């Protein structure tokens, strides 16, 4: 237990093609609620969940101005990092930021996050104590020293322990109809003969929320982890998720195989078989 708020920023330099593109998305648990795109005709923070639409102009305008200023800060950081790594002025580079708060069932802060990546790999992150940094390479040691001198960890900590927890509490209350609601998976086992001697058993879980789930195949009660093809949990497009797990079995062994489904929406985990 129990909830998180996270922001995901992506800045991409485009040398000789103008300013870097800045995109931000905000989430409460597995639900996206806001976005900002510097490439849009009139960049502004926009609602992406019905429950955030009630916020006043002071909310949207304050946030729009933060994103526009953050995009400018990211443009300078991209310039500074290109120099740290002695990289050409022509190549495109990416700077990603991910931050937010995790709260327990009593609404109190469990963990704060403030992490950065450059060109797809860890660059610098705020430690669990929210007072110190972890640089992933010598270039990031330069940023670490700048942020230690500028007392950046205190500025992040102030938000993570204060505002972050308070906004999450407000959003949870406004969006409880969806945010707290269990949406159990709808489950079924399909059977697909491959030849006269082998068949695929595929265990489906559909229309579930939250995204967290475990699907496993057992044979006579023994885990078939190594022989199971498991796809990544995918969005259905209606704020629910889907997943499946398949196993190739010799014909005649089907009834010895059982699919185990674990999800918060279910009172007890399920044990399912092909129901011909």
């Amino acid at each position: 237990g129990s909830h998180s708020m996270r922001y995901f920023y992506t800045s991409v330099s485009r040398p000789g093609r103008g300013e870097p593109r800045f995109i931000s998305v905000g989430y409460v648990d597995d639900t996206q609620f806001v976005r900002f795109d510097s490439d849009a005709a009139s960049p502004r923070e926009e609602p992406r969940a019905p429950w955030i639409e009630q916020e006043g102009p002071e909310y949207w305008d304050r946030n729009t101005q933060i994103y526009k200023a953050q995009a400018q800060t990211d443009r300078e950081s991209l310039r500074n990092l290109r120099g740290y790594y002695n990289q050409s002025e022509a190549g495109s580079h990416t700077l990603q930021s991910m931050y937010g708060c995790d709260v327990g069932p009593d609404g109190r802060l469990l963990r704060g996050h403030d992490q950065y990546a450059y060109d797809g790999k860890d660059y610098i992150a705020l430690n669990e104590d929210l007072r110190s940094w972890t640089a992933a390479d010598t270039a990031a040691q330069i940023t670490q020293r700048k942020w230690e001198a500028a007392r950046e960890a205190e500025q992040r900590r102030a938000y993570l322990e204060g505002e972050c927890v308070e906004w999450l509490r407000r959003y949870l209350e406004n969006g409880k109809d969806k945010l707290e609601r269990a949406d159990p998976p709808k489950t079924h086992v399909t059977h697909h003969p491959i030849s006269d001697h082998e068949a695929t058993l595929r265990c489906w879980a559909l229309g579930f929320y939250p995204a967290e789930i475990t699907l496993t195949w057992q044979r006579d009660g023994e885990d078939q982890t190594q022989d199971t093809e498991l796809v990544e949990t995918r969005p259905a497009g209606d704020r629910t998720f889907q997943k499946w797990a398949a196993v190739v079995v010799p014909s005649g062994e089907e009834q010895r195989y059982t699919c185990h489904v674990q999800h918060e929406g279910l009172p007890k985990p399920l044990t399912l078989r092909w129901e011909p």
């Binding site: 922001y7 931000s24 905000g26 909310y59 304050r62 946030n63 933060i66 994103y67 200023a69 953050q70 800060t73 300078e76 950081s77 500074n80 990092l81 700077l95 931050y99 950065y116 660059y123 610098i124 940023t143 700048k146 942020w147 500028a150 950046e152 500025q155 992040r156 938000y159 505002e163 972050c164 906004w167």
Partner: peptide
């Protein structure tokens, strides 16, 4: 709501 912007890296 988002955090107020950081110092440059």
């Amino acid at each position: 709501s988002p955090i107020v912007p950081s110092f440059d890296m």
